[PDB]
Amino acid sequence: PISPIETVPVKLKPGMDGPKVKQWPLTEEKIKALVEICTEMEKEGKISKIGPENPYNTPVFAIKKKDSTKWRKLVDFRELNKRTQDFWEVQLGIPHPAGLKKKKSVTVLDVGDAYFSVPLDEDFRKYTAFTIPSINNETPGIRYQYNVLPQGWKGSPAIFQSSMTKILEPFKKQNPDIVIYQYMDDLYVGSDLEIGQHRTKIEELRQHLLRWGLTTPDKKHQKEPPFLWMGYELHPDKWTVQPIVLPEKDSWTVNDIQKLVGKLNWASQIYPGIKVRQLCKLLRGTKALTEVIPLTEEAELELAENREILKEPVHGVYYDPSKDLIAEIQKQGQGQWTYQIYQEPFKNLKTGKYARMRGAHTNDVKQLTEAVQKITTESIVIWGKTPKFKLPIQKETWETWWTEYWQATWIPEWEFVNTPPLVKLWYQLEKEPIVGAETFYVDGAANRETKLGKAGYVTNKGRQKVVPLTNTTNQKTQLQAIYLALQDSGLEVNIVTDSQYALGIIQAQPDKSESELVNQIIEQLIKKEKVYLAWVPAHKGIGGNEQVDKLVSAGI
Amino acid sequence: PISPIETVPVKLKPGMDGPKVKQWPLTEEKIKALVEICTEMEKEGKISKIGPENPYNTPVFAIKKKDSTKWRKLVDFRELNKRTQDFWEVQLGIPHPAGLKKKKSVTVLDVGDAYFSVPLDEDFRKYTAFTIPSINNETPGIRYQYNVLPQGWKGSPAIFQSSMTKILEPFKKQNPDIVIYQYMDDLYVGSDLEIGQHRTKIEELRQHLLRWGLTTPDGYELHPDKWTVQPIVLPEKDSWTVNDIQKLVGKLNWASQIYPGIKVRQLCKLLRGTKALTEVIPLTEEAELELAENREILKEPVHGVYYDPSKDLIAEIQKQGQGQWTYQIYQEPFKNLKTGKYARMRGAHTNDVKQLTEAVQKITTESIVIWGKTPKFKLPIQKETWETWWTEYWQATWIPEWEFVNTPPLVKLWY
Numbered sequence: 026p027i028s029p030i031e032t033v034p035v036k037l038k039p040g041m042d043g044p045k046v047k048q049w050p051l052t053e054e055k056i057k058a059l060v061e062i063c064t065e066m067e068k069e070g071k072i073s074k075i076g077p078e079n080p081y082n083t084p085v086f087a088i089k090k091k092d093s094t095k096w097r098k099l100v101d102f103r104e105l106n107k108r109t110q111d112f113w114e115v116q117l118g119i120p121h122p123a124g125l126k127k128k129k130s131v132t133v134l135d136v137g138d139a140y141f142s143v144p145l146d147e148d149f150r151k152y153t154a155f156t157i158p159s160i161n162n163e164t165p166g167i168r169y170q171y172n173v174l175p176q177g178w179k180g181s182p183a184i185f186q187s188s189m190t191k192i193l194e195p196f197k198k199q200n201p202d203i204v205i206y207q208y209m210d211d212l213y214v215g216s217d218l219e220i221g222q223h224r225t226k227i228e229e230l231r232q233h234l235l236r237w238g239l240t241t242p243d244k245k246h247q248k249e250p251p252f253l254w255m256g257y258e259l260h261p262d263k264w265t266v267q268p269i270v271l272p273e274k275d276s277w278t279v280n281d282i283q284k285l286v287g288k289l290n291w292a293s294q295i296y297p298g299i300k301v302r303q304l305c306k307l308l309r310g311t312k313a314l315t316e317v318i319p320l321t322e323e324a325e326l327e328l329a330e331n332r333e334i335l336k337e338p339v340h341g342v343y344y345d346p347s348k349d350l351i352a353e354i355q356k357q358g359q360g361q362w363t364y365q366i367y368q369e370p371f372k373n374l375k376t377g378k379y380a381r382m383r384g385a386h387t388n389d390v391k392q393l394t395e396a397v398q399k400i401t402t403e404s405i406v407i408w409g410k411t412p413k414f415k416l417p418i419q420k421e422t423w424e425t426w427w428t429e430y431w432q433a434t435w436i437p438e439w440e441f442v443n444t445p446p447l448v449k450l451w452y453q454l455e456k457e458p459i460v461g462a463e464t465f466y467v468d469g470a471a472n473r474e475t476k477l478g479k480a481g482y483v484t485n486k487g488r489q490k491v492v493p494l495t496n497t498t499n500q501k502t503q504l505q506a507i508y509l510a511l512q513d514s515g516l517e518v519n520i521v522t523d524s525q526y527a528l529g530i531i532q533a534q535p536d537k538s539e540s541e542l543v544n545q546i547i548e549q550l551i552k553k554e555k556v557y558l559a560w561v562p563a564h565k566g567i568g569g570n571e572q573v574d575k576l577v578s579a580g581i
Numbered sequence: 582p583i584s585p586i587e588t589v590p591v592k593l594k595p596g597m598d599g600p601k602v603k604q605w606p607l608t609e610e611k612i613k614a615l616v617e618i619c620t621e622m623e624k625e626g627k628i629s630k631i632g633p634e635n636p637y638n639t640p641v642f643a644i645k646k647k648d649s650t651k652w653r654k655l656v657d658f659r660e661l662n663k664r665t666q667d668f669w670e671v672q673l674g675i676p677h678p679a680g681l682k683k684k685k686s687v688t689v690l691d692v693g694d695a696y697f698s699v700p701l702d703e704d705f706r707k708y709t710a711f712t713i714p715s716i717n718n719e720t721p722g723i724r725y726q727y728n729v730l731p732q733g734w735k736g737s738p739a740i741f742q743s744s745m746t747k748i749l750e751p752f753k754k755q756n757p758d759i760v761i762y763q764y765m766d767d768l769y770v771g772s773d774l775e776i777g778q779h780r781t782k783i784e785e786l787r788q789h790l791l792r793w794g795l796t797t798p799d800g801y802e803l804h805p806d807k808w809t810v811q812p813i814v815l816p817e818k819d820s821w822t823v824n825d826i827q828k829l830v831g832k833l834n835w836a837s838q839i840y841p842g843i844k845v846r847q848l849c850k851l852l853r854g855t856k857a858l859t860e861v862i863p864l865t866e867e868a869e870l871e872l873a874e875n876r877e878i879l880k881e882p883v884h885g886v887y888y889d890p891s892k893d894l895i896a897e898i899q900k901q902g903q904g905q906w907t908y909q910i911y912q913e914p915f916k917n918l919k920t921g922k923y924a925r926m927r928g929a930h931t932n933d934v935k936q937l938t939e940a941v942q943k944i945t946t947e948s949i950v951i952w953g954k955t956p957k958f959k960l961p962i963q964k965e966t967w968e969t970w971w972t973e974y975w976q977a978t979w980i981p982e983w984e985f986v987n988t989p990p991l992v993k994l995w996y
């Protein structure tokens with residue numbers, strides 16, 4: 026039926042107007058499948074023919090599809106969606122299995138139809154009109170309009186979830202021990218009542234729902250140990266995710282693909298590594314959501330790797346509030362980090378791979394710190410508390426680092442886990458100039474026009490170099506010159522530069538970098554025993570710098 | 582209660598929409614606090630439940646005040662403030678008591694309990710939307726909008742300012758010595774009397790506010806004189822190597838952007854040729870002149886530096902190491918209104934984020950007292966870290982704006 030709830034008022038966007046997209050129909054086939062699906066819905070009260078004529082309109086490309094001889098209408102609200110006011114997303118994300126607690130009894134009611142049982146703001150139905158054509162390529166024709174939350178409309182899950190938390194509030198009041206969680210058409214009902222009393226609440230609730238125009242199936246799905254909520258598999262002692270299969274078809278209607286983005290980004294909350302921010306481009310605007318679309322080289326690649334991650338099922342335990350949460354991280358494939366979150370050993374709640382990397386020149390300690398943060402945020406979101414950490418790093422490696430890092434950093438309570446590759450500092454710069462070391466005066470220069478330059482050095486021992494360069498930029502030859510100095514010198518060296526740029530990077534202490542060059546410098550750096558890098562202002566005629574500057578400058 | 586007053590109408594800046602700021606996740610301890618609190622507030626008509634037809638939101642969270650206590654709500658109205666900020670008159674009452682910074686002590690009170698009396702303009706309520714989150718997204722968020730003047734809104738002390746002047750008139754008469762500045766949600770109260778006295782004339786003011794129906798906690802103690810600017814200073818040790826002189830020159834060369842009389846050439850003369858870093862250089866007279874000369878410019882404070890009221894105040898912080906933090910407050914590059922340090926850390930406190938959080942507050946209450954404006958911060962931290970931990974040490978009812986930066990090699994040029 027149709028819930029008696031009070032409707033949510035819905036405005037068209039600030040200064041805007043409804044969809045006047047004319048239908049591109051005529052098929053003489055399936056135009057009969059509609060008017061049958063319509064006239065059924067017209068009776069359930071979900072729609073109704075519009076009197077005093079006009080206007081507005083939305084498409085109705087109905088796709089009966091290989092559902093095994095079915096007739097399905099498919100209003101395309103894509104254009105009406107762009108004119109409907111924004112709504113607030115009242116959740117921070119989709120719930121995560123590991124965040125559930127053990128309950129003696131749980132039931133999962135399937136709200137039947139749902140969007141279809143909540144009425145639409147009366148003043149706003151007008152903009153939801155559509156059309157079914159006929160023989161005579163002229164009206165004739167027929168024109169309906171929605172009285173209830175339409176399928177693809179922009180406001181239909183936000184409004185529907187609001188209508189629901191309303192309808193439940195009374196029932197949650199009389200029953201404070203029952204926990205009801207909603208998520209689309211699925212409603213999870215946990216409880217620590219004896220199997221028998223539970224089933225009775227579950228009946229009282231199904232009646233409340235019904236008095237409010239909401240029907241819930243009594244034959245109940247296929248409820249064995251695999252009870253299904255939000256596509257997770259809940260067992261009294263573990264949850265498991267139904268491996269997702271991404272079927273390969275080239276009948277990739279704009280729809281079929283539009284449905285793929287939905288499934289994939291639902292999965293990224295369980296599976297680490299799903300990318301969908303690619304094939305989205307195979308959309309944008311309005312381009313007939315029946316118009317078979319060809320797989321590109323950019324999307325058909327990734328979608329191909331997607332099937333790979335979803336390949337292997339995932340599962341874990343439930344959360345127990347009396348114990349702490351422990352997070353363990355390990356280093357993997359350079360910039361690849363693995364982590365597990367558990368409370369009792371070997372009994373993981375959630376596992377993941379963090380990659381990202383932050384900056385153009387990072388290193389292991391700062392990269393670890395980034396992971397300790399991302400993991401921390403996750404723990405607050407899912408369980409609302411902070412975990413204790415086990416980390417491949419020594420109290421003294423971390424200690425010397427933060428205590429010699431110009432920025433501010435911090436990790437919560439942690440414990441050294443002596444494990445496989447430890448995280449360590451791959452070299453350190455001297456704080457004082459080294460005595461009896463060849464003091465290298467470095468510098469480069471580039472001509473922003475011709476793109477030519479030179480990089481070179483000058484020492485206090487008469488050693489000199491100047492290299493001519495093609496297709497470089499000033500700040501690149503500043504790093505080039507520093508590299509020279511490194512590679513033409515003993516294990517212990519004093520370099521002196523005028524590039525605050527070049528000095529920034531090196532002082533950070535990167536061990537990995539975007540630029541190959543910085544890597545070569547990194548390599549050279551760790552091969553040395555003692556290195557001290559120094560800065561001085563250009564063009565003050567400071568001894569050493571002045572000579573090097575002049576030398577590389579037949580470009581300037 | 583909700584005293585029968587005409588809603589003072591209010592309208593955002595032109596061209597602008599109300600706030601739509603995503604909500605940060607909160608710990609369970611905090612969500613419980615915010616659920617209780619709002620529950621009382623909704624009972625008392627102060628706020629109302631709204632649905633998702635209201636596209637506007639504003640982060641909420643909870644802090645545990647200064648020197649321990651029990652939870653308090655705090656609504657991060659930053660986005661709504663700068664979307665509404667300074668409308669017409671009614672603005673920041675008086676152009677800030679230029680005197681207050683001079684007073685021997687200043688005390689802070691939380692008159693925020695006001696504001697819940699005055700209704701809020703109908704057509705604005707929606708812009709005040711805010712949403713308590715859900716652990717693991719189990720239940721939907723619980724959304725409320727405001728019906729009365731909200732605590733962090735800046736438009737609140739403005740609208741209430743007529744009434745606060747009345748309430749206070751009698752007190753400022755019986756006490757024309759004592760200075761009283763309202764900023765946002767606190768009253769800054771500065772006398773010259775002796776501690777025991779001043780702290781007495783504060784309670785009188787609390788009871789005086791009670792007798793007019795305001796009610797306060799039942800902040801800090803602040804000693805404005807003794808916020809001494811920190812003058813840039815050069816190394817003293819005699820035994821200059823080619824290094825020491827090079828640092829010396831680079832610093833003076835930068836510091837010559839602040840003080841235009843500074844000269845370097847006699848020090849570059851000592852460095853002619855391609856010498857090694859370690860090599861000790863005899864300080865020539867002409868140099869030791871330039872150095873004593875220069876040393877004695879870095880002494881006298883600067884001239885040509887005047888607060889400009891229509892311009893934002895900026896504030897940079899640099900981590901200096903031994904629990905020490907240096908900061909400068911300025912409005913155009915190199916023209917510093919103030920510069921200070923902040924220290925006092927060891928053992929059960931050492932925690933970059935905590936110290937940086939404390940410094941950010943102290944710097945900010947210096948600015949309120951000195952100019953009646955909060956500074957837009959340049960924080961030497963990483964977005965993620967900072968956003969991850971700040972509400973754990975915050976104890977103030979306002980929130981300055983901030984940006985995230987990589988401190989340059991100028992940590993050196995200050996200390």
Ligand SMILES: C=Cc1cc(N(C)C)nc(S(C)(=O)=O)n1
Pocket residue numbers: 209254255256269284286287288289291
């Ligand atoms: C495509 C959306 C979507 C949505 C969804 N939910 C929201 C349970 N589940 C799936 S599934 C069956 O593929 O795991 N997909």
